[PDB]
Amino acid sequence: TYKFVNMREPSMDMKSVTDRAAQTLLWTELVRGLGMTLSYLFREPATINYPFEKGPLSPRFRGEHALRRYPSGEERCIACKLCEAVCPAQAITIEAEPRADGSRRTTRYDIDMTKCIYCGFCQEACPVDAIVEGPNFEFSTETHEELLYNKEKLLNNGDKWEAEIAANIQADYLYR
Amino acid sequence: MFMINILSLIIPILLAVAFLTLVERKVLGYMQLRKGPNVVGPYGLLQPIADALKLVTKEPLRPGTSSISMFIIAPILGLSLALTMWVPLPMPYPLINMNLGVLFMLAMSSLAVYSILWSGWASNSKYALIGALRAVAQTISYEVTLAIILLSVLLMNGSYTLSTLITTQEHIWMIFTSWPLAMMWFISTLAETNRAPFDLTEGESELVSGFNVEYAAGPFAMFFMAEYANIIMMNAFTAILFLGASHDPHTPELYTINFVLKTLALTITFLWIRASYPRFRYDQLMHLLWKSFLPLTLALCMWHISLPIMTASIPPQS
Amino acid sequence: RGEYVVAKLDDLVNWARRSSLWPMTFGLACCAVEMMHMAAPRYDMDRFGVVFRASPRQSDVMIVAGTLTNKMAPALRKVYDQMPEPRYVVSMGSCANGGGYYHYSYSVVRGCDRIVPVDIYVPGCPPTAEALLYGILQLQRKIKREKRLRIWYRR
Amino acid sequence: ASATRVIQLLRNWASGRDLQAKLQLRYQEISKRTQPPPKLPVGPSHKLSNNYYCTR
Amino acid sequence: LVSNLTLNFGPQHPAAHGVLRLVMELSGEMVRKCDPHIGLLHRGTEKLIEYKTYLQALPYFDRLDYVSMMCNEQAYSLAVEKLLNIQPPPRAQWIRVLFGEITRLLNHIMAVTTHALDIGAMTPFFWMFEEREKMFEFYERVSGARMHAAYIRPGGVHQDLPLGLLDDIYEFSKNFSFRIDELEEMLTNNRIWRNRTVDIGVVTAEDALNYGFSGVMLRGSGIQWDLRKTQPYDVYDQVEFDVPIGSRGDCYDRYLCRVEEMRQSLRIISQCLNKMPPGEIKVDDAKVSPPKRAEMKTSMESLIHHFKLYTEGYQVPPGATYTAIEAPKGEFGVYLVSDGSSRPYRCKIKAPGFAHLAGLDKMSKGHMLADVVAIIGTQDIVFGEVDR
Amino acid sequence: EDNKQFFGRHRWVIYTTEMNGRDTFWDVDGSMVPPEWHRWLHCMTDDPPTTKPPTARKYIWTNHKFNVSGTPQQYVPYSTTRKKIQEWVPPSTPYK
Amino acid sequence: MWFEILPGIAVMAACLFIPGMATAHIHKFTNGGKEKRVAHFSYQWNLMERDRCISGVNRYHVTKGLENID
Ligand SMILES: CCCCCCCCCCCCCCCCCC(=O)OC[C@H](COP(=O)([O-])OCC[N+](C)(C)C)OC(=O)CCCCCCCCCCCCCCCCC
């Protein structure tokens, strides 16, 4: 099924022709436009008072990355390199080795946040919920170099944001 | 004391322009479901000051291919004309009381077309000149309807004296007697100040900013002040011409309040047109003027010459 | 001493310059639409005095919103040069920051900071309109702490 | 929704329609930002027998 | 003395729809020829895809038509699923159709409002960008990203809808037609908008077909063709809607077609809301779609398949396909070659904007300079998909 | 909170005037919101930390820090790996 | 909402009111407390020139009534 958008012929009688002449000479549809703008002037604006008010987000929101720990304080990352393998932008650089206690742990874990596309594939690939994208989205920097994250930087991000990261994960893990 | 009169006319007009920028931004914002300036000062009341201060401390790039003599003469002419357009205006009593006040305004506003013909030519760039030529053609073409509409309306006044407009409109507004000429006059005034769907010389989405591309910071600011002063002045002329306020010789403040309120209403309507319509094409507005406005204006000038004669309603010439 | 007057004048000029940050619409790619969303009613960048500006001659900040390609870089540098001073550059999005998804491409310059000096790097692909607004306010706070007249007084 | 009766009437008239029934600003009609936990179903091949992968 | 002004510039221009160099010579006032210079946003997407796994290449499609993200990823998912000989589940298909129509609303809002803003009607842009912000919220609630969801994938969708999302989509859609009414109250009957769009950029139906036009650029000229009806995909055959058809093939008819397409998108969205079925949202075949994280942490096969799907990816049987969808900007397609491995051998992306902008010179013939701005706006052009 | 405002304005924070040794009477930013209140403020949940406090961990920062970019506390990247190749050190005893 | 536009409008209104009131009051101050005499035509100018001569103080607006002579 289809429909025509502009297949109406105007009526050609006295009253219709006079209606169109009055519309031509008295600018009635221009007055309708003025009325629409005037009606919008008396509507409450949709503006929010940033930064005192914030745009609404969801637990699934993909922001700044973080490396997480177990309740014991032990790191979750066991350096499987799945996130580095799946990373569409090749933003993840990993080096690992046996730790002094024998654990399988990273010695390098870099994310080039200027290479990153913030797709969240890394946190999908991760089998232990080690790498996540956190809720933070206000981390603009004055230099390019502060956006090339380190393992220390990402672990400090995890320690900084774990309280709300864990709540978001608890909110959404049953969908995953 | 007369010098103080000149100063107390000029300076408040420039302040009114400065805050007209804020008022226009806020009206546009609230018609667009946003707010507009509400952070820099209470309700954006310090925003015009921030704009004026930032502009005068910004580097005024002058073009390497610019005849600097006219490059600086054009803003001087523009602002001097924009300011001097207020000296005959009858807020109850004019600063300058002439027999030919509206003729003086017609002449002074017709001299203002040089500020575009000189800015476009001086800026070179070989393309802003074409925009300047389009602006000049639009301006001169709408000067025709301005002049003829003013001629037809003043046949009830009896003279070119603006103070006589108050007397002419004592019992009734001139709008109730010449509303078709009022609509054509208002749109002609819209077109002359390069506003609304007639802003072809500074089409934000047509030629970025046209004749004002090369101007920056200070001279740009003065050009802007000239345009907004012309806007408020034209709306004041419209209010005095068509919506004459009652005058009490012992209480002229009442007339001033009336006139200021009506001028503000017409200016807010000018900003109202800006937020409601698309932009005319250059040939489309030229067609409007030459084939729609001009024939009706000629017919109505004929009608308004015939009307006082055939009704024994010819005004006094004194 | 006379350093108090210079400090007050610097404060005034830097308040006037950050209260009227007029940016230039350099919308190259997907980051352009989040920036006009920061323009939209919900965030209303005009309420901060940040207007919708025009030709670089009246612009104070360049927002590089999108991928810069090799074919496009000379034009970006040209319009950056044509900006009157003081002028600032905000790099918005991964592509403008360091190449992003297209970092390893033959036709993409890896970060606009190879072409222009950048003041603020807004991360994200795209950064949300709120993230860009945060970057803009951070740029405003950068301008607040400039000491141009105090530098001149101790020269 | 805080607009006075007179302002509502003015804007309804100016727009030509009753815009108070279709406000563009969201209010308590939206869903709660905290929701009960889901329980998602399993696919057709979550079977213990008669499920050889060579047949699917 | 032939000095036809060869103004061969305009990339920084705000009406350039992003990045566009126009080489233009005018016989005085009117355009003689248009020479679009593109490539200013060519990022080598099609070459980069050859170095990416099939899952790794999906986010590239969000950034081609960055006004219609989910439609692009739906087209790519359909191509990969056709090559894989697998079928997405019914609930995933209904979700894909619902978000494709939400995406069509987003794209049509952007197209119409930016067209009007370029013409000089700035006001409708903000009113409708508020609705765009709300639909961005829907995108983010389903995927965590406002624009680049990466949500529709070969095999279905990434995860299910959160509880209460359908209610909010219903709340939004039940009020959206009032906003289309307000947009039409400013443009449709305005004697200035029609003066800028009626009989501007007229294209003949046969000449539209031979120039490779698609979508509204076809149906503006009266051609009764829509991929959602003639060649339905997902569950589009189960949904009822109307195809708006033009009569004059000008900018005004195309604008009316886009507005009525927004209305029919609302009409489809209603049925998607009412007919959403239960079930899984990705194919229950763990050699294509990754298992649930709970099974990945408990079952040996699930862990193995998670590992392999997220490191090597799934192998696609060798072969080539051309699959196209009815994107909001026209026919968006991909010619996807598979050599049998886990990475695409070749991925040519068909974007309607490429053929549409190839026809700018033809449609601008005998028109003023201000009409070319309208003709570009009526061909709605995103250079992310023009240049790829 | 004021639930009679429209969504996006029904919740707001009036920032402190002093945080981490920095005056913030006029200079505030969204990074000053701690993660516990960050979730409620952006409507990721309906529960403030007062009613649903976050789970206590001994490694979670007890003092939230805002964006320290442009300060001497800014992050600067470095290689976290040790040297790969060990050079041969010559003997300190001469052969002659 | 919309009534916050009113502060800028009030500032504009005051700035526009100042010129007319100032003109009226300066005219009253410099013309003997009366309206500034209008001379559009030479007869009115001659009236004012006669007024100046008979005032004795070289000011047209100092009006001599029947108390001057009769
Ligand atoms: C006994 C009485 C004897 C005398 C009778 C006198 C005549 C009475 C009937 C005539 C009525 C029409 C008068 C002229 C109207 C304009 C003429 C014209 O060409 O119009 C159509 C023209 C052209 O319309 P068009 O493009 O549809 O038609 C062109 C020609 N054809 C039909 C062949 C295509 O349109 C315009 O002028 C549009 C103007 C654009 C700007 C709109 C602004 C809107 C806001 C206005 C607010 C109010 C303004 C005044 C404010 C107060 C001022 C103090």
Ligand code: SF4
């Ligand atoms: S979000 Fe995507 S691009 Fe960024 S590090 Fe993770 S996988 Fe790589």
Ligand code: SF4
């Ligand atoms: S962060 Fe996760 S996916 Fe990446 S290496 Fe560590 S355990 Fe593997």
Ligand code: SF4
């Ligand atoms: S950073 Fe991401 S959203 Fe921005 S232009 Fe690049 S690909 Fe598009």
